[PDB]
Amino acid sequence: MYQLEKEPIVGAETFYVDGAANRETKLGKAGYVTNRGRQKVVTLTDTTNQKTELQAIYLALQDSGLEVNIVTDSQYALGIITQWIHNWKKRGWKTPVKNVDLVNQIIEQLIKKEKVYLAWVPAHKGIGGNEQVDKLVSAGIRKV
Ligand SMILES: N[C@@H](Cc1ccc(O)c(-c2c(O)c(O)c3c(c2O)C(=O)c2c(cc(O)c(C(=O)O)c2C(=O)O)C3=O)c1)C(=O)O
Ligand SMILES: [Mn+2]
Ligand SMILES: [Mn+2]
Ligand SMILES: [Zn+2]
Ligand SMILES: [Zn+2]
Numbered sequence: 596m597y598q599l600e601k602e603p604i605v606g607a608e609t610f611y612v613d614g615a616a617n618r619e620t621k622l623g624k625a626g627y628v629t630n631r632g633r634q635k636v637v638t639l640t641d642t643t644n645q646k647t648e649l650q651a652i653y654l655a656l657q658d659s660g661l662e663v664n665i666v667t668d669s670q671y672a673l674g675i676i677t678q679w680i681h682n683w684k685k686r687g688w689k690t691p692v693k694n695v696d697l698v699n700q701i702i703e704q705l706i707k708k709e710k711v712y713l714a715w716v717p718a719h720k721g722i723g724g725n726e727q728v729d730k731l732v733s734a735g736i737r738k739v
Contacts, residue, residue, distance in 0.1 A: 596683055597680055597683070597705070597706060598680070599677065599680060599711055599712065599713055600710055600711060600712040602712070603664045603712045603714070604662045604663075604664055604710050604712050606662075607660075607662040607663060607664050607710070607712070608629050608630060608631045608659065608660070608663065608664070609629060609630045609663075609664035609665070609666060609724070610627045610628075610629050610655040610659060610663060610664065610665045610666070611627060611628050611629070611666050611723075611724030611725050611727065611728045612625075612626070612627045612648070612651035612652050612654075612655050612665055612666070612667050612728065613625075613626065613627075613648070613651055613667075613668060613725065613728040613729050613731070613732050614626070614644070614646075614647025614648040614649075614650055614651045614669075614732055615644065615647060615729075615732040615733045615736040615737055616639075616642050616643050616644045616646065616647045616736065617736050617737060618643075618644075621640060621641045621642055621643070622638070622639070622640055622642070622736065623638075623639050623642045623643075623644070623646075623647040623732070623736055624636055624637065624638050624639065624647065624731070624732040624733075624734070624735075624736055625637055625639060625647045625648070625650035625651040625653075625654065625732060626651060626654070626728055626731055626732050627651060627654060627655050627658075627728055628724055628727045628728045628731065630724065633658075634727075634728075634731070635654055635658065636731050636732060637650075637654070645669070645671050645672070645693070645694060646694055646697060647732070648667060648668075648669035648671065648672040649669075649672050649675075649694060649697045649698060649701060650697065651667070651728075651732075652665060652667060652672055652676070652701055652713075653697070653700060653701050653704060656701065656704035656705055656707075656708065656711075657704060661708055661709035661710070662708070662709055662710040662711075663708060663710075663711055663712070664712045664714075665711065665712065665713050665714070666714055666716055666724060666725060667713065667714070667715055667716075668715065668716055668717060668718045668725055668729075669715070670715050673713060673714070673715045675691060675694075675698055676698065676701060676702070676705070676713065677713070679698065679702055680702075680705075
């Protein structure tokens with residue numbers, strides 16, 4: 596009964612989200628930079644790569660208005676969220692055993708929104724949005 600936008604909401608502020616974790620220490624960071632000049636980065640413990648990407652999306656929804664554009668490089672986070680929206684109650688749908696709690700608070704947050712655009716872009720270089728948030732969350736977590 597909720598449906599993500601097929602194209603970016605024109606006018607809405609865009610959040611370039613990212614996360615990174617290190618597998619030896621389970622330390623990591625999640626955060627965002629936006630096209631209206633606001634950024635946030637938080638440090639986490641006992642986390643994974645997949646967890647930190649979801650965490651980034653969560654702060655995006657946390658800190659944005661009713662219409663938000665979110666660009667992620669995590670096809671996992673996009674898929675697991677999108678699969679939850681689409682299988683909106685099925686007597687034939689088992690729920691994922693991974694990150695169940697995190698994916699559930701995101702859903703809660705996103706049900707509150709009026710319009711969300713969520714899109715995947717591959718990790719890439721340049722001086723664009725995904726590139727700034729990459730190195731912000733990669734700081735002290737991985738070499739890039
Ligand atoms: N582009 C710069 C920095 C750089 C270098 C080298 C790099 O590898 C990256 C780099 C990132 O900065 C990322 O943020 C991510 C990835 C990166 O590779 C992923 O690869 C990835 C990610 C999320 C996922 O969800 C999946 C998934 O869901 O399957 C995968 C995936 O690999 O499958 C993800 O977020 C970034 C350079 O060229 O040095
Ligand atoms: Mn990423
Ligand atoms: Mn990245
Ligand atoms: Zn509106
Ligand atoms: Zn870019």
